[PDB]
Amino acid sequence: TRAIPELTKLLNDEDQVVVNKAAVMVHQLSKKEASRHAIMRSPQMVSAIVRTMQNTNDVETARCTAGTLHNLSHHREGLLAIFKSGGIPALVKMLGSPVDSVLFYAITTLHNLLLHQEGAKMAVRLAGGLQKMVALLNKTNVKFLAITTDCLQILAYGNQESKLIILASGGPQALVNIMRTYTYEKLLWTTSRVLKVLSVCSSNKPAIVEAGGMQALGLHLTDPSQRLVQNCLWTLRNLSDAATKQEGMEGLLGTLVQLLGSDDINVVTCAAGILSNLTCNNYKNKMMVCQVGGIEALVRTVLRAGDREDITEPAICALRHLTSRHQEAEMAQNAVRLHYGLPVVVKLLHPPSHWPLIKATVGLIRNLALCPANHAPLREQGAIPRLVQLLVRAHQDTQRVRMEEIVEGCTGALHILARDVHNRIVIRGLNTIPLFVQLLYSPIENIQRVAAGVLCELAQDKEAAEAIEAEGATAPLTELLHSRNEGVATYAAAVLFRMSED
Asked: Among 4, 134, 380, 499, which is disulfide-ready with 469 (CB 3.0 to 4.6 Å)?
């Protein structure tokens, strides 16, 4: 307490020579916690240590002053002393220091602040800490990297403000690199946490993808660390959502198709969800995923899934995606069948199944139906029946995942299946012409199209054709000829025509 006012003067002395002196003593005196508390409880002393550290030009003076603050850091009260002495901006400024001794005390002190000092993370942002820190992500000391990224995570968590700043500083690229370079699991984990926190940000998300992070993330999906894999999966989850077709996605897709067989049912679900996202409208990802044996893996995930819609929805969507509009699609449809998916798929159409899933399944059935080799098998499973059953009920909840979609779904599915002469025997057996004819009136062009299509396939027989004619099909169809939508107008015609020659 006595040499305190005195030392304080020495640290605020004019020449570095004399300061150096005060610094070394203070630092030293900074170890026996008895003297520690005295130093921490003096606003003058603390404030000088601060000042000197940022202004001194003598490394020994810098490290000692920095180390002293570091030692004060271990005490909740010290943290307070530092906070009220401009300490934070000071420590931030030191994040630019070329010497590691200094760079270390600095970051590590700002960490203990961010972990226990209220008002700290504000102070750190306002001082430009986020940037200096993101720049530091270029250093190679793993434990340094680990402390640093955690600072980022402590600052970014629930603060869009901080996230944006991180992005402007090149955060995405920096973190991705770390995930691609280091093995040290603590670092990998922390970094992946910062990326999860950023992947929810409408702004950051795209950059993370650009930076080839989805690919990077995939290098850890099978890591012994469970805490690591989870953060990667949830991050890939938010990212896979919407994305600009990247490249090299071969490796990741492959690794995802692989996790589909995990022993952990919680891993299989995310791999499933991430594959649905990665394929939703992508003839490129669809191509690769199919060839990595994905169709087989998805179907297999399904059978195993049972009535766990948690797993079945993403899995079915994935298949619906994988069986349409692409080179490999005409083969994926046969695939689903050769691996006994047909049975389990039609099964998912009946309860307990809930809407968002059924919709996807009707979707899958319409595609699998494109392929003739499924027409028979699907009938044999009783798809036509449950399809009309659903249709009729959706339609009645639009007169009495919205119901109008189920209507367009079962009709569009029946329209395809309606391609097999036998499936017409059945469709026409369930006495469904009056409903299809009525659907012509549906305010929705797409419903008309597929309704006109179902009728066109059926009108393929002078028999049904007149059954369609007798149910008042003509007025709605003629008034359906001028529909601005060509597909609708065309079907309308094929029918008007088919029920003629009298």
From this structure: 499
